[PDB]
Amino acid sequence: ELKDDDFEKISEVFKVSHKPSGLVMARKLIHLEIKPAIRNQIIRELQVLHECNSPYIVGFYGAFYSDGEISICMEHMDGGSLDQVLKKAGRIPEQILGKVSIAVIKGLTYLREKHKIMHRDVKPSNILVNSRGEIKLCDFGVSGQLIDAMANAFVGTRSYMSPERLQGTHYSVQSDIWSMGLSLVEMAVGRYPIPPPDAKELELMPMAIFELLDYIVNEPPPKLPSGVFSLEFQDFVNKCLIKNPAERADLKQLMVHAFIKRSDAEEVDFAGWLCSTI
Template sequence: MNEQDIRYRDTLGHGNGGTVYKAYHVPSGKILAVKVILLDITLELQKQIMSELEILYKCDSSYIIGFYGAFFVENRISICTEFMDGGSLDVYRKIPEHVLGRIAVAVVKGLTYLWSLKILHRDVKPSNMLVNTRGQVKLCDFGVSTQLVNSIAKTYVGTNAYMAPERISGEQYGIHSDVWSLGISFMELALGRFPYPQIQKNQGSLMPLQLLQCIVDEDSPVLPVGEFSEPFVHFITQCMRKQPKERPAGPPEASVGAESPGLVTEGKPARHTVTPSHSHTVTPLRCEQQSFAGPGLPRPHLSSARDALPGSRCASLARMKPSPPPVWRH
């Protein structure tokens, strides 16, 4: 794949790591999403990044965004992936709990698949969870390339607001840190705002480290009493325990730490239940298809046969108009 074959159409969004475009691939006729990232790196590092990205061709999961290829043009890398016409979850603001249940199933399955390949996501957040009108939910922008992750970190200064406390503190991290990011992401989607009121993410998720010190120092936020079902509250509480080893994690064979770049020659099949991988007593965190569907919640309207596909609750979400941005009052 090369730039001569790409026809850029619309700008889909600007992230802290680059700009994403909707594009047309002339030879295949496919519509793509192309993320373009400016990097001030050597030719040798460019080659290393391209080598590390090779593992993306081997990722085969319906919960992970499809990868078509990548290329460098001068100091820009373009990463070409599957286009998801519903966009990312961050634009929908507050999402009903019964819809979040379906989304959680897909996201946990996607993470578990990555962990089974010894790949940490490293950047779990609503803007990296994509939906389409077929009702599918897929993860994108996971940290398969250590060199790319490090190069972006050097180019775009700031700390990710969804990072676990141990990552903000500069400590060793692993699967448990992805789990924290999962919990804080779903709490935000449930509340329609970031769980720490003193942190306002108006300009993206990267911000000065000192503004995130509250995540390290304060107790974990909790959901309002009586507004959510017990299983959903349990899910969030387990994910957002301050001590990493008290959080659920993936199966033992998925164990991987920050020192592991996530590049392996083979991986075991993913398991779709998140269970503890340590001796601390924690109830296994199961994401069942009907999880979090509290009593009295209406079944989403099915307007056509296509809506009845697996994941159709998410199809309804993708057809919703995004909520207007909140008005911040001082």
């Protein structure tokens, strides 16, 4: 049994630690009005998320319905999320990006092999690294009813979303893979994939949502310059980012990539770079 009673607020989606267990805990206060009969459904699949643990996935704890809100019982992380850490640090080198890529790849494969469900959303703010240096991607599209409630929600400032899953209701895992490729590109560059910016900004390392979506669906996905990224890295991320699902990087050819092997072989302590950022 778990409840919001034994919850001591610490910081900030509020960072509210667990009282009896002594574990610093996090609650997601994403709340809106739903029929309670629909609200019955959400908890059971979150239990399934609790019963699954992976060395590259967030800590899962049983969630529950409070007095009018849906809270989520996730683990603590001094790394917070990727958005602010990239904002403070600026840009990110190839090695860190590759290790994050293998982390998210194997986490989503763990999902696809355990919970038999797709991500249904991938976002760099949803990417996050443990204070001791572990990528703990969270908040999957596991629960259908939560996604149904989130149908009626805010507007996404930058919907890093696969155009094929947008235009056509025929959707596949390759679409989420394209989404994660876009997330990797965004965290690499450090800005939203607007058309390639000035050569000044590249040498250094407001727009409406609907026209951005139009740009994604119509214009080709942005390319990666070779003057700041290794040829294999950019080639492989572009392969992962192709709009045509035929040559989208499925899971097998995702692990095939040589830079995946380089990230596995290389040594990058996420904690060290985080403290350097912290």
